[PDB]
């Protein structure tokens, strides 16, 4: 460990990998844990907030992009604001030029083009922040998993964070359940609450530690914090 090329992103390893890209993936693996899933007409994200003290507050892991779409925070917290600013500009650019809402599929290629310029040139660095892009367009609900390596793939649901991959087992057995649930936002969010519960180790879900955001056709993107999520605990 801590050998070979730690210096720059433009130097290739003898094994055909990139250490700086692999080191950026470790930020999400040890970062704040969060889960997510989606249905045909709806999408739900669940995040677990952390802090350094009991007397402190809990930063929001979900930043609102537009009315029809949003993202989630994982891995490096401060690098989320950089990609969130470039993403909200592209959402408003399509409304002021093309007068159309930015699709989820096309939104993944925009953030992939921003992170690839820093990896292919000196002086820049790949942003180690995880992003789960949800939204609803004429095609339907879509969810994406963003990684510093540039991998963008649409999934029914996934989890990124600390011990988050251990919660994907519940999503596989229930994969045939929530996909057939349409127009039932109450029972759909409960599917994500039971998913993150499998990743709980030290503490459990509390009022201030549970952050749930839902988006759909008849229901726009809304962030539920505080006592709004107390009914889903």
């Amino acid at each position: 460990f801590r050998n070979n090329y730690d210096g720059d992103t433009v130097t290739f390893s003898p094994t055909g990998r990139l250490f700086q890209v692999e080191y950026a993936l470790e930020a999400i693996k040890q970062g704040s844990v969060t889960v997510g899933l989606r249905s045909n007409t709806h999408a739900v994200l669940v995040a677990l907030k952390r802090n350094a003290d009991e007397l402190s507050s809990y930063q929001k892991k979900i930043i609102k992009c537009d009315e029809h779409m949003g993202l989630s925070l994982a891995g490096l917290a401060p690098d989320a604001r950089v990609l969130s600013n470039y993403l909200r500009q592209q959402c408003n650019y399509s409304s002021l030029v093309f007068n159309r809402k930015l699709a989820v599929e096309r939104a993944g290629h925009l953030l992939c083009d921003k992170a690839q310029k820093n990896t292919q040139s000196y002086g820049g660095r790949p942003y180690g922040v995880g992003l789960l892009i949800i939204g609803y367009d004429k095609s339907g609900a879509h969810l994406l998993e963003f990684q510093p390596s540039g991998n963008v793939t649409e999934l029914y649901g996934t989890a990124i964070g600390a011990r988050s991959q251990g919660a994907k087992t519940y999503l596989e057995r229930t994969l045939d359940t929530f996909i057939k649930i349409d127009g039932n936002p109450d029972e759909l969010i409960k599917a994500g609450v039971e998913a993150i519960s499998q990743s709980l180790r030290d503490e459990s879900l509390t009022v201030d530690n549970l952050s749930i955001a839902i988006v759909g056709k008849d229901t726009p993107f809304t962030i539920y914090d505080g006592e709004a999520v107390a009914k889903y605990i």
Partner: protein
């Protein structure tokens, strides 16, 4: 002294480049993709390895289309493969502005050939560790090219890359000797899926998904599109019948 492999522009004492050789090794760590050249056009094929059941079918586009008749498929790192297509799209768009009629296949290869080579000349940027296979129907006949990490390319009657590049390229030589005079565009669609299954022996430990896109003047008439409907399922049963 050590350090020949630290930088890019530094030449090895044997006459090679480590940054170029290490970029080729990253090509064989990605998903495999092949291609078949016909008389009236070319046929592209790619095998996307499915990780888990959470992947939604046919929502991941491996083959990105530049302009209309120019298809592109890459095997390697995802951002390095998408950056060449996004750069090649700006080259095809800037060409039609001044030069009117779209750029042909052999002329489009010079755009990516000089662009990738510009990365190996400077230590400020890195080369592309992805192998891009692009082609289509140009003004005269048809052409197919495979962009290597070193920037070297030629005309390819067939192309093989990825983990199964060893077993896939061996099957391309059998197709040439089978139809030395010419090969129809409809027959190459089923032959493209057959070679993928023959190269699946190395990738058989995971799930696979078939994605085929072809372009010719016989049916689409200068249009590069994917395969949907019963045509895709027909090539699956024909290729799996010989197994």
């Amino acid at each position: 002294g050590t350090g020949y492999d630290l930088s890019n522009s530094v030449f090895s004492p044997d006459g090679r480049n480590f940054q170029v050789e290490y970029a080729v090794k990253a090509v064989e760590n990605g998903t495999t993709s092949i291609g078949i050249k016909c008389n009236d056009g070319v046929v592209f094929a790619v095998e996307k390895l499915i990780t888990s059941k959470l992947l939604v079918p046919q929502k991941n586009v491996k083959i990105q289309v530049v302009d209309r008749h120019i298809g592109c498929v890459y095997s390697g790192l995802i951002p390095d493969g998408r950056h060449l297509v996004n750069r090649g799209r700006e080259e095809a768009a800037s060409f039609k502005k001044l030069y009117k009629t779209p750029i042909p296949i052999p002329a489009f290869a010079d755009r990516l050939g000089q662009y990738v080579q510009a990365h190996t000349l400077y230590n400020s940027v890195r080369p592309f560790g992805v192998s891009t296979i692009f082609g289509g129907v140009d003004k005269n006949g048809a052409h197919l090219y495979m962009l290597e990490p070193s920037g070297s390319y030629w005309g390819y009657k067939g192309a093989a890359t990825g983990k199964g590049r060893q077993s896939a390229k061996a099957e391309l030589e059998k197709l040439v000797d089978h139809h030395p005079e010419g090969l129809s565009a409809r027959e190459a669609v089923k032959q493209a899926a057959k070679i993928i299954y023959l190269a699946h022996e190395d990738n058989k430990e995971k799930d696979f998904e078939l994605e085929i896109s072809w372009c010719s003047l016989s049916e689409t008439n200068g249009l590069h599109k994917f395969v949907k409907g019963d045509l895709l399922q027909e090539a699956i049963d024909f290729a799996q019948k010989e197994i």
